[PDB]
Design a protein around this ligand. Sequence first.
Ligand SMILES: COc1ccc(-c2oc3c(CCC(C)C)c(O)cc(O)c3c(=O)c2O[C@@H]2O[C@@H](C)[C@H](O)[C@@H](O)[C@H]2O)cc1
Ligand SMILES: [Mg+2]
Ligand SMILES: [Zn+2]
Length: 326
Amino acid sequence: EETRELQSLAAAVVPSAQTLKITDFSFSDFELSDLETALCTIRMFTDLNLVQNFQMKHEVLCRWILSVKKNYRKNVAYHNWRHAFNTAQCMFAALKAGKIQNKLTDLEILALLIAALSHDLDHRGVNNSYIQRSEHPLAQLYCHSIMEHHHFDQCLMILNSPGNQILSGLSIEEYKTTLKIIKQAILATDLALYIKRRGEFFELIRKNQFNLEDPHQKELFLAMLMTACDLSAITKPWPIQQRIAELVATEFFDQGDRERKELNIEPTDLMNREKKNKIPSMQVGFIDAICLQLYEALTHVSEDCFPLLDGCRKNRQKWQALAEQQ
Ligand SMILES: COc1ccc(-c2oc3c(CCC(C)C)c(O)cc(O)c3c(=O)c2O[C@@H]2O[C@@H](C)[C@H](O)[C@@H](O)[C@H]2O)cc1
Ligand SMILES: [Mg+2]
Ligand SMILES: [Zn+2]
């Protein structure tokens, strides 16, 4: 049944953040049941003071979380509920352990958590923005569909569904503002927009010009933070990192098989199952081109986010070792 879920969740005792280990950057969701990931999510909203400050009724928050989880597809190897959940957990860790919570307003935090959980809702296993030839230093290409996505639209649909209105406690103006931030946060998770706007952020950081209170720069930082959390699987302790990387590869190969049948074209190497041997070199190219500079830059705003950079570095070394073939 579909309510046996709400029934169990609404009545369950929500363990502390410490007990749930959600404050750790090295957090793993693998050992948790779906119910436990929902409890972890309730704790995130609670410890960031969102339930209290925004007058969220318990049953409403529970129904919303379940609705979000239900709208992801378990048959998609990587971009599913566990990815969204991990993205939100990383956001929680960055806000708490990284001390980013005091740098932002409660409305921004509310928007970020909702965005983290909802950003990949319109994912059917079709990756429309990625890097081709990452293993080729001088020939890497960033590709993206000419058409756009409806991730925000799905997020809005759930937020406005009867019984799921976790934003009903906001004022008319607060509601409008918050929706704008959520939309921008979700759009920011598209690699295309990240690649497009990161230069400005890196330059500000390099020149010690980053100003939290400049609205334009605040927006830019929130977009960068979203990407940092979205890509955080790449920073986990090696064994966790590799398990997640296998999922990403599986999804990519499944896409290549599908586009082969639907478009009669051979997939780029990234989505070609027969090119598995090249994975380590591809992982290294991706980390160098997209991840390392972002995690380095984040440490300049939040020194305590160092674990993300540290993990990214360690994993690059291990992937590189494999590329050279141990
Ligand atoms: C385990 O943590 C990971 C995080 C991201 C990735 C990842 O790898 C990539 C690799 C490495 C080779 C592989 C066989 C994986 C490429 O060669 C080219 C890419 O564009 C990506 C990529 O976009 C990507 O990011 C993931 O997919 C992209 C599509 C998403 O936008 C992003 O959020 C994330 O989920 C892999 C592992
Ligand atoms: Mg995605
Ligand atoms: Zn994502």
